[PDB]
Amino acid sequence: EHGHSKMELPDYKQWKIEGTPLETVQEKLAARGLRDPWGRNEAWRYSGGFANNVSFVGALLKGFKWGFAAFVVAVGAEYYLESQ
Amino acid sequence: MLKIIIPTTMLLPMTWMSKHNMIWINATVHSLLISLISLSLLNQLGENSLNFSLTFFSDSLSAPLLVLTTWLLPLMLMASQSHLSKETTTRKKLYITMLILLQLFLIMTFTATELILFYILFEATLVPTLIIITRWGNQTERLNAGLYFLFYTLAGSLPLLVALVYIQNTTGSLNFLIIHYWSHPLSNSWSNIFMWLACIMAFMVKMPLYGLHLWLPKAHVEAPIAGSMVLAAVLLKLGGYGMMRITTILNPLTNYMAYPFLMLSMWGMIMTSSICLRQTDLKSLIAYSSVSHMALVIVAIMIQTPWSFMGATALMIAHGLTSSMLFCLANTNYERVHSRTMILARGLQTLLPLMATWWLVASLTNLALPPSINLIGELFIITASFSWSNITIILMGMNMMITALYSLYMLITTQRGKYTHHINNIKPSFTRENALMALHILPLLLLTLNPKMILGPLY
Amino acid sequence: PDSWDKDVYPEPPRRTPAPAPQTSLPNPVTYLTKIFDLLVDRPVTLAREFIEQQHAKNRYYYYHREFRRVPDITECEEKDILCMFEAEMQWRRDYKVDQEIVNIIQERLKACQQREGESYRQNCAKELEQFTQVSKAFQDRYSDLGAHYSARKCLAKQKQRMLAERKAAKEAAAA
Amino acid sequence: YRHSIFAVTHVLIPVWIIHYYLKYHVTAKPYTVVERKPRIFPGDTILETGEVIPLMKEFPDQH
Amino acid sequence: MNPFASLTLTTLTILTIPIMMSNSNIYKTNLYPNYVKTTVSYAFTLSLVPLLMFM
Amino acid sequence: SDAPPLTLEAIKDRVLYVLKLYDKIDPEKLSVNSHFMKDLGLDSLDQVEIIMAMEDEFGFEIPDIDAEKLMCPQEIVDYIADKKDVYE
Amino acid sequence: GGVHIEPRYRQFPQLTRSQLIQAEFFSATMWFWILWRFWHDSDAVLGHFPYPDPSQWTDEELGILPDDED
Amino acid sequence: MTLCLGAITTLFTALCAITQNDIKKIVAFSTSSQLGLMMVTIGINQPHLAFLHICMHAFFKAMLFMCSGSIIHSLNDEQDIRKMGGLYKAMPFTTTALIIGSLALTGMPYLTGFYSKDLIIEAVNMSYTNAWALLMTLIATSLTAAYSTRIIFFAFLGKPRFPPLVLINENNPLLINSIKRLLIGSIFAGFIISNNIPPMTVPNTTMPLYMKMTALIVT
Amino acid sequence: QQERDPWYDWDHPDLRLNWGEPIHWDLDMYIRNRVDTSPTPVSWNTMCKHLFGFVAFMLFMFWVGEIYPSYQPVGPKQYPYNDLYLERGGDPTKEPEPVVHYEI
Amino acid sequence: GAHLARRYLGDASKEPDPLRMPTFPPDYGFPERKEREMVATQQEMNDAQLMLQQRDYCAHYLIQLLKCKRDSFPNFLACKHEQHDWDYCEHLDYVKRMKEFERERRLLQRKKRREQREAEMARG
Amino acid sequence: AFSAPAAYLTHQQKVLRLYKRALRHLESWCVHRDKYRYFACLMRARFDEHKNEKDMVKATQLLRQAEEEFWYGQHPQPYIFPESPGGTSYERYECYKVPEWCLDDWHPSEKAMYPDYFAKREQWKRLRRESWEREVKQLQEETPPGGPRTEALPPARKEGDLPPLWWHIVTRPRERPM
Amino acid sequence: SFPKYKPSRLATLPATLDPAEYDISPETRKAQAERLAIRSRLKREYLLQYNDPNRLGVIEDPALIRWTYARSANIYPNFRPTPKTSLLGALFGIGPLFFWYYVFKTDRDKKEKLIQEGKLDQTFNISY
Ligand SMILES: CCCCCCCCCCCCCCCCC[C@@H](O)O[C@H](CO[C@H](O)CCCCCCCCCCCCCCC)COP(=O)(O)OCC[N+](C)(C)C
Numbered sequence A: 001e002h003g004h005s006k007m008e009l010p011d012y013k014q015w016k017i018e019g020t021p022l023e024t025v026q027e028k029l030a031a032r033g034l035r036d037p038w039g040r041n042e043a044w045r046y047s048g049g050f051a052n053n054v055s056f057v058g059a060l061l062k063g064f065k066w067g068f069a070a071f072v073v074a075v076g077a078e079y080y081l082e083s084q
Numbered sequence B: 001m002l003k004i005i006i007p008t009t010m011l012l013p014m015t016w017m018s019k020h021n022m023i024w025i026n027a028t029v030h031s032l033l034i035s036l037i038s039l040s041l042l043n044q045l046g047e048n049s050l051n052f053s054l055t056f057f058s059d060s061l062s063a064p065l066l067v068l069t070t071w072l073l074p075l076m077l078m079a080s081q082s083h084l085s086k087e088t089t090t091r092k093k094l095y096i097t098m099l100i101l102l103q104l105f106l107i108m109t110f111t112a113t114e115l116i117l118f119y120i121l122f123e124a125t126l127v128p129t130l131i132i133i134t135r136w137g138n139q140t141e142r143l144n145a146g147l148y149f150l151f152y153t154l155a156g157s158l159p160l161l162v163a164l165v166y167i168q169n170t171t172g173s174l175n176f177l178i179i180h181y182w183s184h185p186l187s188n189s190w191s192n193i194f195m196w197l198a199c200i201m202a203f204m205v206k207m208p209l210y211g212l213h214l215w216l217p218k219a220h221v222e223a224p225i226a227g228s229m230v231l232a233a234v235l236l237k238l239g240g241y242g243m244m245r246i247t248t249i250l251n252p253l254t255n256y257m258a259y260p261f262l263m264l265s266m267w268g269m270i271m272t273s274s275i276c277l278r279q280t281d282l283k284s285l286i287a288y289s290s291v292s293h294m295a296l297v298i299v300a301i302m303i304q305t306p307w308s309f310m311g312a313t314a315l316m317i318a319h320g321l322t323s324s325m326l327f328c329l330a331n332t333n334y335e336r337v338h339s340r341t342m343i344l345a346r347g348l349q350t351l352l353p354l355m356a357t358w359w360l361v362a363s364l365t366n367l368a369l370p371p372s373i374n375l376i377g378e379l380f381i382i383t384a385s386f387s388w389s390n391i392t393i394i395l396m397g398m399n400m401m402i403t404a405l406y407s408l409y410m411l412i413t414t415q416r417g418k419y420t421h422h423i424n425n426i427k428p429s430f431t432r433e434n435a436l437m438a439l440h441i442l443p444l445l446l447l448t449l450n451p452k453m454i455l456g457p458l459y
Numbered sequence C: 001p002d003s004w005d006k007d008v009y010p011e012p013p014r015r016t017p018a019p020a021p022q023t024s025l026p027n028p029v030t031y032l033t034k035i036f037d038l039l040v041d042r043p044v045t046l047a048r049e050f051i052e053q054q055h056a057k058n059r060y061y062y063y064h065r066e067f068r069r070v071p072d073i074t075e076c077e078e079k080d081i082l083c084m085f086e087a088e089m090q091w092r093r094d095y096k097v098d099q100e101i102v103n104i105i106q107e108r109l110k111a112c113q114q115r116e117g118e119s120y121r122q123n124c125a126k127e128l129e130q131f132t133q134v135s136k137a138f139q140d141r142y143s144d145l146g147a148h149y150s151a152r153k154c155l156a157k158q159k160q161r162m163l164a165e166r167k168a169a170k171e172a173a174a175a
Numbered sequence D: 001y002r003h004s005i006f007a008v009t010h011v012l013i014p015v016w017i018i019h020y021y022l023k024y025h026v027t028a029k030p031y032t033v034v035e036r037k038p039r040i041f042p043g044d045t046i047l048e049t050g051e052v053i054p055l056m057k058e059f060p061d062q063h
Numbered sequence E: 001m002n003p004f005a006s007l008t009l010t011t012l013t014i015l016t017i018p019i020m021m022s023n024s025n026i027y028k029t030n031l032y033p034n035y036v037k038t039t040v041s042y043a044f045t046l047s048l049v050p051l052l053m054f055m
Numbered sequence F: 001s002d003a004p005p006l007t008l009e010a011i012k013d014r015v016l017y018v019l020k021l022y023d024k025i026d027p028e029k030l031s032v033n034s035h036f037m038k039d040l041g042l043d044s045l046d047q048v049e050i051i052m053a054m055e056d057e058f059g060f061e062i063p064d065i066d067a068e069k070l071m072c073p074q075e076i077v078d079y080i081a082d083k084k085d086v087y088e
Numbered sequence G: 001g002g003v004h005i006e007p008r009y010r011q012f013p014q015l016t017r018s019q020l021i022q023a024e025f026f027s028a029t030m031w032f033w034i035l036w037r038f039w040h041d042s043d044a045v046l047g048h049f050p051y052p053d054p055s056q057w058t059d060e061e062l063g064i065l066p067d068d069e070d
Numbered sequence H: 001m002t003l004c005l006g007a008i009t010t011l012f013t014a015l016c017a018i019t020q021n022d023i024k025k026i027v028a029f030s031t032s033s034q035l036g037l038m039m040v041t042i043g044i045n046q047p048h049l050a051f052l053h054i055c056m057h058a059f060f061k062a063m064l065f066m067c068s069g070s071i072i073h074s075l076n077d078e079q080d081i082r083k084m085g086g087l088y089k090a091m092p093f094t095t096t097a098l099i100i101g102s103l104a105l106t107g108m109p110y111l112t113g114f115y116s117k118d119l120i121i122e123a124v125n126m127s128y129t130n131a132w133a134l135l136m137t138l139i140a141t142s143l144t145a146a147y148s149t150r151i152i153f154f155a156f157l158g159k160p161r162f163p164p165l166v167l168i169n170e171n172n173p174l175l176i177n178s179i180k181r182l183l184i185g186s187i188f189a190g191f192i193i194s195n196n197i198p199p200m201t202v203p204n205t206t207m208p209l210y211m212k213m214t215a216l217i218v219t
Numbered sequence I: 001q002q003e004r005d006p007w008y009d010w011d012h013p014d015l016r017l018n019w020g021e022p023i024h025w026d027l028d029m030y031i032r033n034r035v036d037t038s039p040t041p042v043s044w045n046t047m048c049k050h051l052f053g054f055v056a057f058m059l060f061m062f063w064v065g066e067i068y069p070s071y072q073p074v075g076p077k078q079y080p081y082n083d084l085y086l087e088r089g090g091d092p093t094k095e096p097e098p099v100v101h102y103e104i
Numbered sequence J: 001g002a003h004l005a006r007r008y009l010g011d012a013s014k015e016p017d018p019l020r021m022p023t024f025p026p027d028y029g030f031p032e033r034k035e036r037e038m039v040a041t042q043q044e045m046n047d048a049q050l051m052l053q054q055r056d057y058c059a060h061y062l063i064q065l066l067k068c069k070r071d072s073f074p075n076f077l078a079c080k081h082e083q084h085d086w087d088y089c090e091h092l093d094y095v096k097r098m099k100e101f102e103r104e105r106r107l108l109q110r111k112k113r114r115e116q117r118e119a120e121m122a123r124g
Numbered sequence K: 001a002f003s004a005p006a007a008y009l010t011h012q013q014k015v016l017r018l019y020k021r022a023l024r025h026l027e028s029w030c031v032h033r034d035k036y037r038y039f040a041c042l043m044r045a046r047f048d049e050h051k052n053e054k055d056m057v058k059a060t061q062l063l064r065q066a067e068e069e070f071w072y073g074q075h076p077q078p079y080i081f082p083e084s085p086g087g088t089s090y091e092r093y094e095c096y097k098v099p100e101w102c103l104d105d106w107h108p109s110e111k112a113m114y115p116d117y118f119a120k121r122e123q124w125k126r127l128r129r130e131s132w133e134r135e136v137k138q139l140q141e142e143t144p145p146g147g148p149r150t151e152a153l154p155p156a157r158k159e160g161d162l163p164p165l166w167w168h169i170v171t172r173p174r175e176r177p178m
Numbered sequence L: 001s002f003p004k005y006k007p008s009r010l011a012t013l014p015a016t017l018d019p020a021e022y023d024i025s026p027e028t029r030k031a032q033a034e035r036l037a038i039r040s041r042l043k044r045e046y047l048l049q050y051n052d053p054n055r056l057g058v059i060e061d062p063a064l065i066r067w068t069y070a071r072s073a074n075i076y077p078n079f080r081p082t083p084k085t086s087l088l089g090a091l092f093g094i095g096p097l098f099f100w101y102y103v104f105k106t107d108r109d110k111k112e113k114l115i116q117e118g119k120l121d122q123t124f125n126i127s128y
């Protein structure tokens, strides 16, 4: 059992520089009179699920909210139990 | 002791009256049976010795050597069975006769209650080895190698006979028991110095000492596989046995006298281990490794402490077995490649996996991996040298490291990497060769369970 | 156990404390050791009993060899080989016995060091002094003989030491 | 079923040999197995003798 | 008798059994790694007992 | 690994994909056998940039000697198939 | 022993809900453990015993005479 | 000599680590720096605490290599961090495991690393030692934090940089179970072991407030 | 042999040699498993001096730190029974000098 | 730490060397000079066989801590009070050591002031 | 690797190789894609400035001077593809590459399995025996007198002919045999 | 300008930084052509001996034979006693021996003196 599903490639017109830092690269390059011939080749790195990034502090705080909620529930239960 | 000697003598008429295609089968079976018979001698006492008669005695220094000498013959026959295939029956019978005579001479040499009998047999072992080297040898330099091997030995040993007859004229007996009980100090005199030199140099040349080690690479490279086996396994240990036997008379002169030899061996082990790193030949590399090990044995004997003697005995046995195995492996490679150079045939682990496993085990046991008896002797000698002087360890340390290096180097050049594209005549390893390696290696790992059986009389 | 003598290898009474459960929680150690007993110790014990009754059905004994005392090297003529042989054998046997004595003392020392644990430096001074004394004695007799040691060499060493001691005593008295 | 036989032929059988070999051969010889002489604390009692270690010097207890 | 020694030697001993069986038929099948993994896990859970006794 | 057994169709599809995202070439004019020097008017530097894109796309880098004499997508596909031992 | 997941070729790979929920649960449990230990045992980081000031101790307790007795 | 050797080793290895591109090389240099810290602990006559460090480091560094090997296998045997970009969402379980491992290595309060490494820092600071060795240990802690965040940033945060054919997969019970066992270990082992073992050394129960927080502020 | 071209089709790809070509006298010292002469981005002298400088600096500063250690504003640790005399070495039949520790 | 800067950069004789402390007689400050107290004796504290470096004046709290650690085993968090007590006893020992250091420092200061005053009066 | 080498490298080959090395090392320096694209285009533009230069001495002055600059900023730890001569998996699978002639040494009990494979192998052996005998003559007649000048082999020119010296190029083990 | 790279023995000059390559001449081109011609002739001979079906043996390499023979058997017949050879041989074969003899002799003399005066503390030394 291997991956034989006949995968088909997407359409090459989908990849556009717009909305990516390569657009800024194009602006900076045309400010000097130059143009990148491979701009659309690397657009897929900014198109799909890779478009939304996370910060370092957000990366460290992966499960802070759920843990905090569990913590407050547990401390409330302990405070209501020991006070008896 | 005749229960071992007479069957060895009967091996000759049995071989010469054998059917033309049954010599190897008959010889191997009866050699193994004689080896089994030799096992009885191992049960030694903490008392004096096993004095069978006026002519022969046994000792726990002599018993392991006798057992190894008996065990070596079936292995030599199995190794020689291959390259003697296109040979006439008469010459194969002559080869087997020479091997049997060598075993008989060694057996009588190791018991030898008297020193002149010991010398006679010690030099009688020389003729069969010379004939084997110079007759069934491949290259044209076998004649020069035989000349070197003969003349180094005789130049070393001719003063020994004069020293022995002089010692008997003065003392009155050459018997080992009488000599040990009646030993008297030797005054520090010029005549006594030369007597010490004459008594020691004959056994020093056969170890061999670093200064006098030239004959050995020639003899090992040019001899057939059986010749290389018998030279590396037993013939080198004759010098150590002779030194351990003759050193008793030498004291207290040995302390002053020992320094030139101690320095030569401690530097020559480093020199030869370093030579092993840059070698283009398997046989020469194994020969130089043997030289390094026997230099360490020389150091152990010269220090002359109980731990030194036990370490020397254990190291001699372990080196004999390991070097015989290494030469057998190199010969198995040579019989396929016909070049006998490491860099030509490469990546043999991919083609011959079990033979690569045998190579790994042999290189590990040459590397002195614990708890093998190789490292037992290594460590006993190192501790004795440290007690002798706390600086020796540094040299010893270097030696160990260098040893490991070239061992794994020999394991990496020939077994690992990419196989040479052109060689296509590498056939699967035969059952005979695998049995040879197994019979070489199993006794070592059995002996490491009972080290006291090879630790000598000072245990 | 009766297999070995208690006086040769002394042991303290081995006082052990009592279990004092301060809580009602069932500890796992007791239940674990009980199930270990039930699953391991009983079958081993019954196998041992079967082997012991099998051994008792056949019984034989072996006797420790005893040796007479023979004149030593000091009661031997300068060239009389028979008495020198007997004395050398006796001296070698005595050397083996002394080696075993030192082994026994070292075993005592190691056992003390392990048994008293953290206070081994104080509670094993007796064994340390015992080993120091026996080591001093053993070293004097055989330390420098080396390989090819013999009774004559040991006697010569003892004579050299005792002339040194006699000279030292005479000089101290005549100081 | 797979874990039933394995826990017998790989755990139960090996411990039978070792426990038999330890309890009956190794401990037959002296000083082969040496324990720690476990700690004795004040207030404890010893099963073999039955005596009790006296308590301590009643230090002033505060905070 | 004082299962500390028996258990602490049994762990190391049972750690060696797959090396013994390396010449058996199981070594030529695809179940050998799982065999070794199960042996290691059982050795760990068996060595947990002397740790509890020490604690 | 768990790597699907890529075929000639997949190789050629990915080659033409990379070439069509090359904006210096209008996609509707290129073809499988279309030359690089003459049929598309591309510089040699443009060809070596194409080699860059191929190496970054297939995860392996082509030696310079072989790379500098590759002028068609078809022969590039053939070379890469020979390197990867592609059956169909 | 897994499920069949095909390659994607330049889009975000398929994500199983099981791995996401397991990772989120483990991160949340780790953070909850940190916060629980912080509430229950806070002195392990902040300390429980104050550090004394050597200059605040008066000369009487330290054994000091006014520079003339000794 | 042991203290100085440990200090120089941990400094040099962390300094080499903070600038490597191979993830395996970075983590191996982290291991070497931890060994240097262990010999620093030995040199100040605290062997039991060094043993505790060995036991905790085993857990979290082994799990760190599990995460690294998972990444390498998922990126078709790619080890350079220059060819790995966004993996925080593309592969979440390895992400959280590597985050927890990096936090434990750095020494987060109440984490497995904290029980050992915090006591290491306190004992080195509260001892009659070399000033240079203490300074080098503190700089080594700084560089440990440095290469930890370097690994996280260059493997987990940026835009993807791997070849277009995406073969990223984790849905395999073996990898997940093996990683999560060491995750539970690297979360709770320090706490349970420290509170279960008997006490074996005199504590630094009193300490200046700024000198108690030196490890955290350096990290 | 390491800096030989790794893309040429040698007859011995691992050793990077051709069949009939002459062999260097020190080939076995240059076998890609041993010393190599491939140029580095930094010059040999710079690495030596830089490496030597770093090692020397470390040795000197460790010596200085030995000369100038670090400690705490505290006195030596005090032990109850004659500085633990009986259980550090023993010798009870000597009755050493008693020590009384200062109460403050 | 601040004493290191004061010593290695300032006056060497101004502050003590921790190796040779104390350098003055104990009762030099006041003649009361109470002696320190023991709760644990030789025999029981040997029976506990704690460790040689743990054999300090805080031994009793440590012995009770081990008593709790042995008795309430599965509840490894049962006795926390004795852990606090032993921490407090070590805290008191360290505070007393700090006070001893400060005391010897101020005796050194006053002594140095004394010979400098004596030098001033002698030169006058 | 497949093509035969040339007696030398021309100026344009050298400039192309320098461009390749510099662009790879700049990609190694510029981890992120946008930064790499911007700097690579800046480098390409700088490179194209001297494109129409005709002076050969000036041409020699160009690139060689650049090579010194490249050597100064060559990123001592560049990115290398895993299977490249510097990669971390350069020769991982060379230990699995077993020669074909080894199959000639198999025991008949082993050859009982896989009979169709060995039949096809026998057909291959027959084809090789005929084709080599043809190829010897073909190469003898086509080779220039005095020995070959370039190690490139000619193709087959007849109908039944096969490429000369083809057996050990066609029968490579595999890239990943196991 | 940029800092210059200085070659050494163990770090040779880079291929692209050799001043010799940029100095191109027809003689140099002819030399490279004949070098590649020799290389291609050797390659052709090896492949002719390699591809043949009939051959079932190791191909003998005269270069390897020459290398081994020169390394092993051609040394002494080409030896000439020279001041360089004499001094290097004497040093490397005598100096270490006397150095180690001096070191060990001094160590053993010190130990023997210490044991004569007896201030050596050889307690528990029973194995030698
Ligand atoms: C070539 C590879 C190695 C081969 C084997 C080499 C090992 C054999 C070398 C022999 C070792 C030394 C031989 C004699 C040593 C005696 C001790 C001497 O060296 O020390 C001084 C001796 O002084 C001088 O050495 C005098 C001798 C000088 C003449 C010897 C030649 C020196 C170099 C020759 C080396 C050539 C050896 C090989 C010959 C073929 C002590 O002064 P002294 O107290 O008065 O004599 C004490 C001895 N008494 C008591 C018997 C009188």
Ligand SMILES: CCCCCCCC/C=C/CCCCCCCC(=O)OC[C@H](COP(=O)(O)OCCN)OC(=O)CCCCCCC/C=C/CCCCCCCC
Pocket (backbone or CB within 6 Å): B152, B155, B156, B157, B159, B162, B163, B166, B190, B191, B192, B194, B195, B196, B197, B198, B201, B205, B212
């Ligand atoms: C390389 C080996 C080491 C060589 C070291 C020295 C080499 C230089 C010597 C060359 C040969 C010299 C021949 C003459 C030596 C004379 C020695 C001698 O006569 O002593 C005999 C001595 C006492 O003589 P008496 O007159 O009977 O006593 C009465 C008064 N006390 O008696 C004996 O011990 C006899 C023993 C024979 C001495 C051996 C002579 C040969 C040299 C010793 C061997 C060393 C060389 C070995 C060669 C090594 C080649 C492998």
Ligand SMILES: CCCCCCCCCCCC(=O)SCCNC(=O)CCNC(=O)[C@H](O)C(C)(C)COP(=O)(O)O
Pocket (backbone or CB within 6 Å): F043, F044, F045, K011, K012, K013, K015, K016, K022, K025, K026, K029, K046, K047, K048, K050, K051, K052, K053, K059, K060, K062, K063, K064, K066, K067, K069, K070, K071, K073, K074
């Ligand atoms: C990060 C590391 C730093 C590296 C530093 C690199 C330095 C870069 C600057 C070098 C400056 C130059 O251009 S080097 C100047 C070398 N001389 C010439 O370029 C003259 C003629 N040019 C050619 O012939 C070419 O091939 C060409 C026409 C371009 C295409 O050819 P195709 O039509 O056959 O593709």
